[PDB]
C-alpha cells in the first residue's frame with residue numbers, strides 16, 4: 413500500500429441492477445458496508461476527496477454497517493462464504509521487498525463475521541489515486 | 542372513504558391502532574432473538590454452566 417489506493421471491494425452474484433449483492437468500501441475514516449442492488453455504471457474511482465463521485469445508485473438495500481477506522485507496507489486479507497456467513501480475516505506487516513509477496517510466516521486473525529445469507533460469484537476492486 | 546371518528550360514539554365506532562408482525566423462514570442464519578440471561582459468576586465451587 414504505502415499510498416492507500418485500494419479503498420474497497422465489490423461482491424455479488426450479479427451487480428448490474430439485478431440480484432442482491434454486497435459492497436465494502438473505506439476512506440480511512442470508517443468502513444462502510446452495504447448489501448444493496450447496484451449497477452456500477454462507470455467503474456467507481458476517485459478521479460482527482462477534493463473530487464469524488466459516488467458509485468452506482470441507491471436501491472433496495474437489506475443491511476448496513478459502519479465502524480473501525482480501518483488503516484514499504486503490506487496488508488493481507490481472506491474472504492470466504494460459509495452457508496450464509498461471510499467471513500473476513502486480515503493482517504498488517506511492513507516489508508522491504510518491492511517485487512512481490514515476501515517469505516516468512518503470517519497468520520490472519522479474524523474480523524467480525526456477516527450473516528448475509530446471499531451468494532457471491534464475482535468480485536472487483538475499488539481504486540483511487 | 543374518509544373516517545368519521547367522532548368522539549360522540551360508542552366503543553365499536555371508536556378508532557383503534559393495530560400492529561401486525563410476522564417472521565420469515567430459516568433460509569439463512571437468524572438475526573433477531575429475545576434477550577439472553579446473564580447471571581452472576583461463581584468461583585471455587587462445582588457448578589453447571591452455559
Ligand SMILES: *[C@@H]1O[C@H](CO)[C@@H](O[C@@H]2O[C@H](CO)[C@@H](O)[C@H](O)[C@H]2NC(C)=O)[C@H](O)[C@H]1NC(C)=O
Pocket residue numbers: 437438439440441442443444478
Ligand atoms: C468517508 O468518510 C466520512 C467521514 O468523514 C464518512 O462519513 C460517514 O458516512 C456514513 C455513511 O453515509 C454516515 O452514516 C456517517 O454519519 C458519516 N459521518 C459523518 C461524520 O458525517 C463516509 O461514510 C466515508 N465514505 C466512504 C465511502 O468511506
Ligand SMILES: *[C@@H]1O[C@H](CO)[C@@H](O)[C@H](O)[C@H]1NC(C)=O
Pocket residue numbers: 432472473474
Ligand atoms: C428487496 O430485496 C429483498 C431481498 O430479500 C426481496 O425479498 C424483496 O422482494 C426486494 N423488493 C423489491 C421491491 O425488489
Ligand SMILES: *[C@@H]1O[C@H](CO)[C@@H](O)[C@H](O)[C@H]1NC(C)=O
Pocket residue numbers: 496529530531532
Ligand atoms: C445460491 O444459489 C443457489 C442456486 O445455485 C440457490 O439455490 C441458493 O438459494 C443461493 N443461496 C444464496 C445464499 O444466495
